[PDB]
Design a protein around this ligand. Structure first.
Ligand SMILES: [Zn+2]
Ligand SMILES: [Zn+2]
Ligand SMILES: [Zn+2]
Ligand SMILES: [Zn+2]
Ligand SMILES: [Zn+2]
Ligand SMILES: [Zn+2]
Lengths: 131, 131
């Protein structure tokens, strides 16, 4: 995830942390893990970095049930949706043109100019049910 | 909108005020509107009664983009999704089988035991463009 400004070891470290993992996580959890592995990087610094990255769109954002935003560096850059298990945090890249066509059709029927759909599916793995 | 608690003027007043308005609105906005109407009802009371109603399923919740929560009453008791114009705040309920079929297919393919899909979509309506 290249940054608009000059690259610095803190930005490189947070980028390495983002690409290191695949689950969704907020600023606090990534701050914890980067400090524990030996980065010593600021909370507001990582917050600003992920704000800039989300503005660039290199990462993907998701508001949890409480409300806090979690972020995942997704491999696929095209339009896509994520199936997320809260017990595991794993994200599966799922994309469907049917929902996009439905959104376009309902927007056209209602005469709406632009459509910005938020579609999230929350579930549990089969292993989660098993003990 | 019956409330699980005992009959009291607070619950009746907040339920009637919610019924009068047909727009997604936050707790503070509802509190201010009720104060202006002369209810003289508490804000913590609004929050508690609104959470009780949401748990009862008689009301429809939604999370704002910035983080706050808005709530609205829809006449239909059946499951439905919402198109909400951020500029005006007006919300309209629709239902399309395609999202349900896609969710079922994804759950079957990935083996997820149970899933909970949230589909709330946003777009500007015609009157926004009109001047
Ligand atoms: Zn992705
Ligand atoms: Zn999409
Ligand atoms: Zn799981
Ligand atoms: Zn509704
Ligand atoms: Zn509008
Ligand atoms: Zn649905």
């Amino acid at each position: 995830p290249p940054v608009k400004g000059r690259a610095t070891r803190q930005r490189a470290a947070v980028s390495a942390a983002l690409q290191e993992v695949e689950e969704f996580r907020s600023a606090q959890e990534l701050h914890d893990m980067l400090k524990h592995k030996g980065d010593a990087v600021g909370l507001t610094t990582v917050y600003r970095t992920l704000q800039s990255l989300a503005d660039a769109g290199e990462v993907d954002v998701l508001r949890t049930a409480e409300g806090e935003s979690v972020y995942r560096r997704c491999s696929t850059g095209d339009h896509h949706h994520h199936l997320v298990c809260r017990a595991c945090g794993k994200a599966v890249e799922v994309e469907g043109p049917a929902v996009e066509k439905w959104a376009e059709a309902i927007a056209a029927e209602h005469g709406y100019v632009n459509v910005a759909h938020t579609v999230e599916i929350f579930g549990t793995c089969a292993d989660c049910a098993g003990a």
